[PDB]
Design an enzyme around this catalytic site. Structure first.
Site, short mmCIF file in Angstrom:
data_model
loop_
_atom_site.label_atom_id
_atom_site.label_comp_id
_atom_site.label_asym_id
_atom_site.label_seq_id
_atom_site.Cartn_x
_atom_site.Cartn_y
_atom_site.Cartn_z
CG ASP A 1 -4.26 4.71 1.00
OD1 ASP A 1 -3.36 3.84 0.95
OD2 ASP A 1 -4.12 5.75 0.32
CE1 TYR A 2 -5.56 -1.90 3.10
CE2 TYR A 2 -5.10 -2.88 0.97
CZ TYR A 2 -5.88 -2.79 2.09
OH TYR A 2 -7.00 -3.59 2.22
CG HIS B 1 0.37 -1.81 -1.88
ND1 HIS B 1 1.62 -1.62 -1.33
CD2 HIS B 1 -0.36 -0.72 -1.55
CE1 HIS B 1 1.64 -0.46 -0.69
NE2 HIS B 1 0.46 0.11 -0.81
CG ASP C 1 -4.78 1.24 -1.31
OD1 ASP C 1 -4.43 1.23 -2.51
OD2 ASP C 1 -4.06 1.68 -0.40
#
Lengths: 686, 260, 99, 593
Positions: free
Chosen positions: B166-167, B42, B153
């Protein structure tokens, strides 16, 4: 230590004293400044010259803002990249440099300053007798009617503005003493030329003792009766009547911190019961040092029965995730200086991760505790370690002597005899001796690292050391991977600051170890602050949240305010200015913020008598000044005419309640106003 | 003498708390697995510049700061380019096409819930309009009243249409096609990511409604995008990405449910 | 059954700490009331509560429960003599002859 | 040096950290030959091997390829005796040295004192007890009705009475316990006025309670007066409890100072007596005490590393000495055969083998060639023996299918929701036995495939309801020992595993309270010794490995009460019958001296 303390002053010299560093950059000295300023001007001059040799950018906070104000002084109204509007909320103290940059910024971006002041009038200081003409400007109100200083032009001369200094009387004595911070701040806000100031003030209708004080501070009036003449000294009816049923402002005398918080838990229950709508989120408890009262806050709130239990949240507490992982690793960095006492190595085996890497089970550690004791393992690990401390070489009572004594007993029975002049240890001849092999693999790794950590290395050679020491001595798990990552993150960030500053000299390990201890403990967690359980945390400057119930703990004299002494060679403390910030004036102004923030009830508690020797203690001067203003400005309904001092001490004794020494004392359970909600000690008191 | 202790009649306190979705539920495959490798993956896209290609000196210094060796960087700077160049949804939006003006990274939102939120009173509405809520039992969480927290994210707009990103990484054991349209949605139901994007959309819908003058859901909303890092492959555009658009009738009743 | 209640005490010991568990142990066993009934037992109770305060003090620093027991056993062998570790004065001693 | 080279063995897992650190400390800085020779000695001693002969260490055919790093160190001096004895780490036994080199076998002083104490007690310190031969013959005639033929049980009783220390060898179901009752009955009847103190002992409490009940049924078949029934022993206890072994420490309450207070001592299932316990028992025995051991020569625990009884009965095949054959002829009233030659007089005269018992015919054909083995499992089927040829995996699944048939009665009683006590007795009706620990055929191999076969078929769904569990290691606190089984079920108070105490009372244990547990649906042939099983199945690998041996298959067949089944290859099983377990212990070499 010197390089860190000097870097802290140059940072303060950047913010609050940009003109000094501007003169020190050319090499000239400031006239009329405190001693020690001599050697400091070259140390900054060389610093700007040394960072110029490294090629790093020359621009810095000091010399930059002057050109920043000048480039925004004459320019077009639309510079690119700047936001539409900016808000300043909750900040009651700002340096003059920032307000000068924001004043020149107002010509383009609209800035709204949200500022909470207790007095609706102007309580600030004055520069010159000609400066009040610029302070005569009106303040706009939502009623569109202009507002000006009270008494109009008569209060300017008056006794208020006196000599060449600022305001003298300053109305209410509580605002003058405690408000020394906001004084200079409201003086800097009114100095802005292009600023448009408008006020919105909600009048507090006095009813409770709390609303009486907030009134007097708001309207800026002195309600204390000094008794200048005997005619005023006799009749006490001229004060404000106080109802005996008012719980708004109460003072409580306790014995220890334990019994103090345990009583607070009983008074918070009485406040939750007495009102139909009270949210524990709306209740706050502020302590001098949260770390000292943290075990007692957790104990009384965690031991409460189900029906009696209420949620609690501790904030500003120093963030600590895994205690042993951090402490053992710091003890691992002391290996070159460690004497390797038997209790210390067994303390390293107390961590389950260090034992998991070497697969020493908890059931097997009990065997090692008795084996190390009986096999005579006391002194350092090796014989070379003994000579390294300049102690005569023996050859016994060492981890090598013990291991060999234990390994020899596995092969040969103790009844045979001596071999190397080491008697075999007979206790483990069996499969349980396998743990001796795992313990012997630990001391081998301890012998390798202690020889590698002794030599000083450049900063670039210390980068892999943390990653190589963690995986070798520890086997990570799901819980400890988070703490070990915070170790590598903080360890590598320290070296990245050293490599970013171009330091090529070798560094000892003792410097990086103590640097880890300081930076690791400063981490805190605010996540649980507003989560909705009752808020427990230390008093933080500039943070004021209006609350219905406000509690205060640890008000004993010398504990509050928090005493931080200047470095003693600092030049700012010699010649103070307007926007100078001191920790003493921060905590003194915090006590005023906590007084105005409470909208319903105010709780102030301190230790009057020490529970140990049964001696006398004293509350903080701030609390002492408050109880003196309450008794002089108020009287009890019992005696409407008695005397000024006699009614004073009568009100101060009525609001002050002395709680007992022990929780089982029957006085707490007597029916009345103060009654403990604890049912556990009810059969003990009976 | 006689004595007694007072007893509280009313409840000592009710439930008012600030919690996120975590308080409710309670070769790329050879990359290490855990919380530390996930936070590093991230941290890459956090400061990463999408328009500019990947610099190997930048990847070497990021793994150096994180403690990793040089064994990774040759395998990283390539895989990163495959993620930024992958088209998304129908429009085929590439991550490198997003200008910094349209980029918003790590949005922290506070979504208040007024009345106490009951599990059974929620999943019935969820399972109604959402086909993904048919699998697995209903969500189990205690009654909660307060503020809701969450971390988005990435949020970006393209062609005047906003999107949600989103990750997720995880997936310790899988490399090949085991990331698919059926399998990715199967793990979305396993980890209960269904409610997560449904709460993320209600958030984004209220933020777009508040910030944008004359806002409409159907017009400006482009749907949800769930980007699986280790599932992104140059061979298959569908593997690693998951896109689903709320029914627009679920958020209308959801916003009313949380309002009162 | 005693193993069951001592297991429940270990649960409160793990979830809360030393002070809440000793509070629940004294409340269930009713020993706090029984000690005050025994002659000279209030002096005994003042030491139990004071130790429960020191164990809560040292319990917050050390998270390991076995290291907490080792800390207590280590202080029992050799007295620390610290002023905070000194015996507090018994209540009502104000009315007792002072030596 | 070789130090860092030995550090790779830990990562290679060929040596334990105890073996490497013991090698660095004791050998020290001497030649790397002495360092690794103490390394492989500590490794074999850790696995239970008594000694390390020099011929095995020298040959390149040995295991642990780290040995191939010796050619770069020892430089092919070809003399292991000259290199090792020169260093202070090895001596001839004169000096107080950790390692001792005597008969070309190198091994620790611990194993040296234990081998010397055991081999001497059988050769020396034992006295021939002379009693009236006429009276002793009249007693044995009243115990055994048939005098027409030579009775092996009559010789076993005569040898044990005439000699202080003796061993009675025989297979399961051959009447060993009955012969002991005849020995104990004739022992109490021999001395009327003299004190007779009898003690029963076993290495495991399981076989101990098996000894008390079996000895009880056999003794009530013989008449005795009230004084004889007063001297009858009460019950048997674990050999660790008999010696008073403390749970925490290794000390014993008896040892040399305090002798056991006894007249005669009977140790059942002496096969599980490793060399340490035999040496610790000898010094605890007084000079007036007679000791009798029970067990079989072909039991795997006798040929395992560290065992005693395996090499003791190895000389029993020679037979009795020429003189004792005439003396036993005057005792038993028959013709006792005389062994050819003279090897060891005291040892051969103290041994007796009982040759009188499909299980018996097969086990007797194991010691013979494979022609009798294949013929016995084939024709007439005996109703106690079956054979399934296993090569391809399709026969490996049918193996698991009949494995369910043996557990068919057991699996139903789990699903029928019975009581724990009857189910404990029910799990003893079927058990699985496999040679290897790992691989497609093995403990680690079957437990995964068997539990996978429990997922494919719906019998039991997965601690899962109705699961049998065995204890891996002994526990002194809970009263349960290694080799004991338990059943986990919910009585309604909670999910708990239940055990059967020797007193008959059930004992509930929480799942987290067990020290060690494992899936018992398949057992290691060594761990099942002493237990009884109504039906049994043997699993042998299609691979050819020395792990499969004769005494392993023997203890698999003897582990079944009545029913037995086999899945093996005729090529793999019969060839493993020819291969026998090799013992390195120097005990049999001292008996030849």
């Amino acid at each position: 230590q010197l390089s860190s303390k000097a870097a802290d002053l140059f940072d303060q010299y950047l913010v609050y004293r940009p003109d000094w560093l501007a003169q020190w950059e050319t090499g000239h000295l400031v006239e009329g400044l405190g001693e020690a300023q001599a050697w400091q001007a070259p140390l900054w001059k060389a610093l700007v010259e040394y960072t110029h040799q490294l090629g790093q950018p020359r621009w810095h906070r000091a010399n930059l803002y002057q050109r920043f104000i000048e480039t925004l002084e004459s320019a077009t109204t639309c510079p690119p990249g700047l936001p539409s509007r900016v808000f300043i909320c909750g900040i009651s103290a700002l340096p003059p440099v920032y307000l000068q940059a924001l004043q020149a910024l107002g010509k383009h971006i609209e800035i709204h300053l949200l500022f909470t002041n207790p007095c609706r009038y102007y309580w600030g200081d004055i520069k010159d007798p000609a400066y009040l003409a610029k302070l005569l400007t009106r303040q706009r109100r939502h009623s569109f009617e202009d507002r000006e200083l009270p008494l109009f032009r008569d209060s300017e001369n008056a006794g208020q503005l006196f000599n060449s200094d600022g305001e003298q009387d300053v109305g209410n004595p509580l605002l003058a003493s405690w408000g020394k911070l906001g004084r200079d701040y409201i003086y800097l806000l009114s100095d802005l030329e292009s600023s448009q100031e408008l006020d919105a003030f909600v009048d507090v209708t006095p009813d409770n003792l709390l609303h009486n004080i907030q009134s007097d501070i708001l309207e800026l009036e002195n309600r204390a009766v000094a008794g200048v003449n005997i005619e005023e000294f006799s009749r006490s009816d001229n004060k404000r009547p106080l109802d005996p049923l008012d719980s708004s402002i109460t003072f409580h005398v306790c014995h220890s911190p334990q019994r103090e918080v345990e009583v607070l838990h009983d008074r918070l229950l009485a406040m939750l019961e007495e009102d139909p709508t009270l949210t524990p989120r709306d209740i706050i408890v502020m302590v001098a040092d949260i770390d000292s009262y943290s075990p007692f806050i957790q104990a009384v709130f965690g031991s409460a029965p189900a029906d009696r239990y209420l949620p609690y949240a501790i904030s500003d507490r120093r963030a600590r995730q895994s205690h042993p992982v951090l402490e053992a690793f710091i003890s691992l960095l002391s290996l070159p200086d460690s004497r390797f006492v038997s209790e210390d190595v067994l303390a390293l085996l107390d961590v389950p991760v260090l034992a998991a890497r070497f697969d020493i089970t908890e059931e097997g550690l009990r065997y090692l505790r008795q084996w190390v004791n009986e096999s005579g393992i006391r002194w350092g690990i090796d014989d070379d370690n003994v000579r390294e401390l300049e102690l005569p070489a023996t050859g016994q009572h060492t981890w090598r002597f013990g291991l060999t004594r234990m390994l020899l007993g596995y092969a040969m029975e103790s009844a045979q005899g001596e071999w190397q002049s080491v008697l075999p240890y007979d206790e483990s001849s069996g499969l349980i001796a396998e743990l001796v092999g795992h313990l012997a693999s630990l001391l081998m790794q301890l012998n390798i690292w202690r020889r590698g950590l002794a030599q000083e290395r450049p900063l670039e050679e210390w980068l892999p050391v943390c990653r190589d020491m963690l995986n070798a001595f520890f086997l990570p798990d799901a819980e400890t991977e988070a703490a070990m990552t915070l170790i590598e993150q903080q360890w590598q960030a320290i070296i990245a600051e050293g490599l970013g500053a171009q330091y090529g000299d070798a560094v000892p390990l003792s410097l990086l170890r103590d640097e880890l201890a300081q930076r690791l403990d400063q981490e805190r967690i605010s996540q649980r602050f507003l989560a909705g359980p009752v808020n427990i945390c230390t008093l933080m400057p500039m943070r004021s949240i209006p609350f219905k119930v406000v509690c205060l703990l640890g008000m004993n004299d010398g504990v509050y305010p928090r005493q931080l002494a200047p470095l003693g060679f600092d030049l700012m403390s010699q010649k103070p200015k307007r926007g100078d910030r001191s920790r003493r004036d921060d905590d003194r102004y915090l006590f005023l913020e906590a007084l105005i923030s409470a909208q319903q009830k105010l709780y102030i508690s301190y230790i009057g008598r020490s529970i140990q020797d049964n001696s006398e203690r004293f509350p903080s001067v701030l609390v002492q000044e408050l109880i003196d203003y309450i008794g002089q400005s108020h009287y009890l309904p019992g005696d409407e005419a008695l005397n000024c001092d006699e009614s004073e001490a009568r009100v101060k004794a009525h609001l002050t309640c002395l709680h007992t020494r022990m929780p089982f004392d029957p006085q707490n359970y007597q029916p009345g106003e103060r009654q403990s909600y604890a049912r556990e000690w009810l059969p003990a008191a009976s | 003498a006689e004595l007694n202790a007072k007893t509280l009649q009313r409840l000592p306190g009710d439930n008012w708390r600030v919690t996120s979705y975590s308080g409710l539920q309670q070769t790329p495959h050879q990359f290490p697995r855990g919380a530390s490798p996930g936070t590093f993956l991230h941290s890459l896209f956090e400061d990463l510049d999408f328009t500019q290609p990947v610099d190997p000196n930048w990847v070497r210094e990021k793994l150096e700061l994180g403690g990793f060796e040089s064994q990774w960087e040759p395998v990283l700077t390539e895989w990163i380019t495959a993620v930024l160049q992958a088209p998304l949804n129908e429009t085929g939006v590439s991550l490198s096409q997003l200008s910094a003006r349209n980029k918003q990274v790590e949005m922290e939102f506070y979504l208040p819930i007024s009345e106490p939120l009951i599990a059974s009173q929620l999943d019935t509405l969820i399972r109604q309009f959402d086909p993904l809520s048919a699998g697995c039992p209903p969500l189990e969480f205690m009654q909660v009243r307060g503020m809701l927290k969450g971390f988005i994210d990435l949020v970006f707009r393209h062609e005047g249409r906003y999107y949600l990103l989103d990750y997720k990484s995880n997936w310790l054991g899988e490399d090949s096609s085991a990331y698919t349209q059926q399998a990715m949605a199967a793990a979305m139901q396993a980890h209960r990511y269904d409610l997560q994007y449904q709460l993320y959309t209600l958030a984004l819908h209220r933020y777009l409604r508040h910030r944008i003058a004359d806002y409409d859901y159907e017009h400006h909303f482009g749907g949800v995008i769930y980007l699986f890092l280790r599932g992104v492959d140059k061979e298959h555009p569908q593997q690693g990405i998951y896109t689903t658009r709320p029914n627009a009738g679920l958020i209308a009743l959801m916003d009313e449910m949380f309002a009162g | 059954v005693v193993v069951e209640e001592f297991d429940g005490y270990r649960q409160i010991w793990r979830k809360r700490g030393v002070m809440p568990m000793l509070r629940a142990l004294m409340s269930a066993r009713n020993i706090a009331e029984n000690l005050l009934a025994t002659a000279g037992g209030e002096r005994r109770l003042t030491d139990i509560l004071h130790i429960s305060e020191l164990l809560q003090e040292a319990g917050t620093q050390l998270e390991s429960e076995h290291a907490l027991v080792r800390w207590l056993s280590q202080h029992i062998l050799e007295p620390d003599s610290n002023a905070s570790s000194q015996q507090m004065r018994l209540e009502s001693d104000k009315h007792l002859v002072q030596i | 040096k070789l130090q860092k080279q030995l550090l790779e063995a830990v990562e290679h897992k060929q040596l334990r950290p105890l073996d490497v650190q013991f090698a660095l400390t004791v050998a020290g800085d001497e030649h790397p030959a002495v360092t690794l020779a103490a390394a492989l000695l500590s490794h074999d001693a850790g696995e239970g091997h008594v000694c390390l002969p020099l011929s095995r260490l020298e040959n390149n055919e040995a295991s642990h390829p780290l040995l191939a790093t010796c050619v770069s160190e020892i430089g092919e001096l070809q003399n292991w005796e000259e290199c090792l004895l020169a260093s202070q780490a090895v001596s001839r036994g004169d000096e107080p040295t950790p390692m001792i080199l005597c008969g070309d076998r190198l091994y620790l002083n611990r194993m040296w004192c234990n081998e010397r104490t055991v081999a001497r007690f059988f050769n020396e310190v034992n006295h021939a007890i002379e009693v009236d031969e006429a009276l002793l013959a009249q007693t044995l005639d009243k115990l055994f009705p048939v005098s027409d033929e030579i009775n092996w049980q009559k010789v076993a009783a005569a040898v044990a009475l005439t000699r202080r220390i003796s061993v009675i060898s025989g297979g399961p179901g051959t009447g060993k316990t009955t012969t002991v009752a005849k020995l104990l009955a004739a022992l109490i009847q021999m001395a009327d006025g003299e004190r007779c103190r009898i003690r029963l002992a076993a290495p495991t409490g399981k076989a101990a309670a098996r000894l008390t009940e079996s000895l009880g049924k056999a003794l009530r078949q013989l008449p005795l007066t009230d004084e004889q029934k007063k001297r009858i022993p009460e019950d048997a206890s674990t050999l660790h409890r008999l010696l008073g072994a403390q749970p925490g420490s290794q000390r014993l309450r008896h040892h040399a100072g305090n002798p056991l207070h006894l007249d005669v001592l009977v140790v059942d299932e002496a096969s599980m007596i490793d060399l340490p316990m035999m040496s610790r028992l000898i010094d605890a025995l007084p000079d007036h005490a007679r000791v009798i051991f029970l067990g079989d020569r072909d039991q795997l625990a006798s040929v395992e590393a560290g065992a005693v009884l395996g090499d003791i009965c190895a000389y029993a095949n020679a037979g009795f000495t020429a003189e004792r054959a005439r003396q036993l002829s005057r005792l038993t009233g028959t013709h006792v055969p005389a062994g050819t030659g003279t090897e060891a007089a005291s040892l051969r005269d103290s041994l007796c083998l009982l040759q009188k018992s499909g299980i018996g015919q097969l086990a007797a054909a194991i010691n013979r060639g494979d022609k009798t083995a294949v013929k016995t499992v084939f024709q007439q089927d005996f109703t106690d023996i079956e054979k399934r040829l296993l090569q391809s995996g399709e026969d490996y699944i049918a193996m698991l299918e009949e494995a369910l048939a043996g557990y068919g009665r057991y699996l139903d009683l789990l699903q029928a929701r019975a009581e724990p006590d009857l189910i404990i007795q029910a799990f003893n009706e079927y058990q699985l036995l496999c040679a290897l620990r790992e691989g497609p055929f093995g403990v680690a191999g079957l437990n995964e495939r068997i539990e996978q076969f429990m997922q494919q078929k719906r019998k039991i769904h997965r601690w899962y309801e109705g699961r049998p569990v065995m204890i891996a290691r002994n526990d002194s606190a809970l009263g349960l020992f290694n080799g004991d089984i338990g059943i986990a079920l919910d009585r309604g108070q909670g999910t708990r595993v239940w055990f059967a105490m020797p007193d008959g009372n059930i004992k509930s244990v929480q799942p987290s309270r067990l020290p060690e547990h494992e899936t018992t649906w398949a057992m290691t042939v060594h761990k099942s010794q002493g237990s009884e099983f109504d039906h049994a199945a043997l699993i042998l690998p299609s691979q050819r490995t020395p792990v499969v041996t004769r005494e392993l298959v023997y203890t698999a067949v003897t582990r079944a009460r009545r029913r037995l089944s086999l899945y093996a290859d005729e090529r793999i099983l019969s060839a493993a019958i020819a291969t026998r377990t090799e013992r390195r212990s120097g005990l049999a070499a001292l008996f030849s001296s």
